[PDB]
Design a protein around this nucleic acid. Structure first.
Lengths: 88, 66, 106, 117, 70
RNA sequence: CUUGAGUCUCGUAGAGGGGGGUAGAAUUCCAGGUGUAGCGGUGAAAUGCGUAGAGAUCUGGAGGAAUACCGGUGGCGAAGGCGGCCCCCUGGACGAAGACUGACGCUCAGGUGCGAAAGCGUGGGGAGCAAACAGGAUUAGAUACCCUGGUAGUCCACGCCGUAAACGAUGUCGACUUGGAGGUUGUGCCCUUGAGGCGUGGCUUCCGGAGCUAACGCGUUAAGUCGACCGCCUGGGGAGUAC
RNA sequence: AUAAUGAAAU
């Protein structure tokens, strides 16, 4: 998983304060960081099926949180996806 | 049942402690069961690990006829 | 940086080179911003079973802290050196400074 | 011949036969005997009595070497483990050691299949 | 099992010591059980059956001492 | 809005998964010494191996498959499954005291992944034993059960196949309803008598009360009392067969 | 150790 320093840095960058650990932006950013990191691991170990379930769970959780944010506030959603570089 | 490690509050079993490890093997070199000595399961697992490490490093034998 | 415990064994008829070996390995670890927490030389000991028709090996123990690459290089050195007949490297959770049971009853 | 005075006896005790071999302290054979060659065949070959007789014959066959002290090594599960030692003692040797050297693997090769009769 | 005959020690006592040491080591059981291959299904079934039999016998013998035969 | 659902800080136990090294016991084979008539196998036998020196005993070397004891009605995983020791990468569970978001949830036709043994394709490797096959026997016969040999396969890399009494023959989620004895893994306070008492969480084995069931039995881990969604059945053969 | 069979009804 991520390290303490990296987690603290992301929380400071994306949260309203160094104690806002449970905002949607912070959650999405943390999931994105870990998903990006694991691409290197799975390009070398292609037959590690047991670890891949966790990755897929992360992907699903991020999708659901983004749908909720898009429903509740469009402007914040646009800004967040622009900042994180998410689209197909 | 009486377990000396639980009596003395130990943290790890220390594969370097041959004098202690000697009480828990038979004369053929085999590991004694827990139901004979009265150890707890946690410390039994730790003890087996330590004995295997010592066997590799040659501080203890494997069998009685090498 | 992580914490490691290392043990290695040397041929009995090469016991005169152990101080030089210790010095060189210590220098290799210290040059990479690491530290040395425990060092011990146990002398010649009788083996429990023969290894390559030998008994009477020379034992050295160390507890150190360093990066991974230094430890990998040290392992390669052990592999290609012929005075060393066996070695072991293990990871620990914290630095260990106390004295070993072999320096309390030998 | 050449005197020795210190020897080893090897006992091979299987479910079907018993073999006794006497040797010096370096592995060089001096004489041997078996239950199947002592006048027993079939259902009488795997008895303690046959092992007894075989041990007596083996002791007789090595009398020109003048042996006094014997070590004993036993290998196998069959009937013949103890009668042979008793006969060797009765012949007139002095027994110094007894050891069991049956081979036991630490999970190696696959054994044969079970018999359905 | 390694036995050294002690001074003044007769032969029968040494023989009995050898037998006791062999039984404690348990070499005959190992040899007998390694003669033929056994399937994992059979191994697991035998283990469970032994445990169940022991438990049931314990309960029966402990609860049978609450009655009078005559 | 904070009670469902999540994020953050400190720890704990584990045969959970992918990659690379290494150790000790045992089987087989090759090359030598000592020694001399048997060995091996069965209910009883002989096919086989042996004076061209076997079987037994001792010394040196090669190779590749599995990890005794510990080890248990023990542990981990969605299921299939996972067991020597060391290092690198990596997934999930649980506990104590606090802070944060604010219904962000449950089920899921079609779709997409994973999926024991045997089997198929291309390239490697091959101790042990083993479909097919060959020869002793037994029998009225014996294309079998028993004995002596023995190759495909069993092992490794990559790609196919999609089935099992794949079983607790019991779909997933939430709430409520008398007791007893154990296993395993966390954590609080202390009469103080420092080796012992009194509490509070997760997982798990057995017995049994009311209720339920055709009976056998299930019984807070329900087959009891209720709510939300999904899959399936409608006499036996013909048939999970034909097109 | 091995070692087969018994029309339909009352």
């Amino acid at each position: 998983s991520l390290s303490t320093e990296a987690t603290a840095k992301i929380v400071s960058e994306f949260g309203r304060d160094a104690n806002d650990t449970g905002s949607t932006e912070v959650q999405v950013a943390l999931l994105t960081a870990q998903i990006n990191h694991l691409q290197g691991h799975f390009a070398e170990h292609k037959k590690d099926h047991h670890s891949r379930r966790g990755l897929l769970r992360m992907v699903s959780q991020r999708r659901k949180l983004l749908d909720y944010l898009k429903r509740k506030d469009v402007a914040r959603y646009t800004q967040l996806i622009e900042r994180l570089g998410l689209r197909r | 049942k009486f377990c000396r490690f639980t009596a003395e509050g130990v943290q790890e079993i220390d594969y370097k402690d041959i004098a202690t490890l000697k009480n828990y093997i038979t004369e053929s070199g085999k590991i004694v069961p827990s139901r004979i000595t009265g150890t707890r399961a946690k410390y039994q697992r730790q003890l087996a690990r330590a004995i295997k490490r010592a066997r590799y490093l040659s501080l203890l034998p494997y069998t009685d006829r090498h | 940086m992580r914490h490691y415990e290392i043990v290695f064994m040397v041929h009995p008829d090469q016991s005169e080179q152990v101080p030089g070996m210790i010095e060189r390995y210590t220098a290799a670890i210290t040059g990479a911003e690491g530290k040395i927490h425990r060092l011990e030389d146990w002398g010649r000991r009788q083996l429990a079973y023969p290894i390559n028709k030998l008994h009477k090996a020379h034992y050295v123990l160390m507890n150190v802290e360093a990066p991974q690459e230094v430890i990998d290089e040290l392992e390669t050195t052990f592999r290609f050196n012929d005075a060393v007949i066996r070695s072991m490297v293990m990871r620990t959770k914290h630095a260990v400074t106390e004295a070993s049971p072999m320096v309390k009853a030998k | 011949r050449k005197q020795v005075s210190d020897g080893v006896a090897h006992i091979h005790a299987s479910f079907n036969n018993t073999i006794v071999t006497i040797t010096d302290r370096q592995g060089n054979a001096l004489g041997w005997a078996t239950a199947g060659g002592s006048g027993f065949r079939g259902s009488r070959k795997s008895t303690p009595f046959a092992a007894q007789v075989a041990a007596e014959r083996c002791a007789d066959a090595v009398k020109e070497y003048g042996i006094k002290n014997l070590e004993v090594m036993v290998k196998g599960p069959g009937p013949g483990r103890e009668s042979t030692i008793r006969a060797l003692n009765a012949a007139g040797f002095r027994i110094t050691n007894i050891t069991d050297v049956t081979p036991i693997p630490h999970n190696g090769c696959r054994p044969p299949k079970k018999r359905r009769v | 099992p390694v036995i050294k005959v002690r001074e003044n020690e007769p032969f029968d006592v040494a023989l009995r010591r050898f037998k006791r040491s062999c039984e404690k080591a348990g070499v005959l059981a190992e040899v007998r059980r390694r003669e033929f291959y056994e399937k994992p299904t059979t191994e697991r079934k035998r283990a469970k059956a032994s445990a169940v039999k022991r438990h049931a016998k314990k309960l029966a013998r402990e609860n049978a001492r609450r009655t009078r035969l005559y």
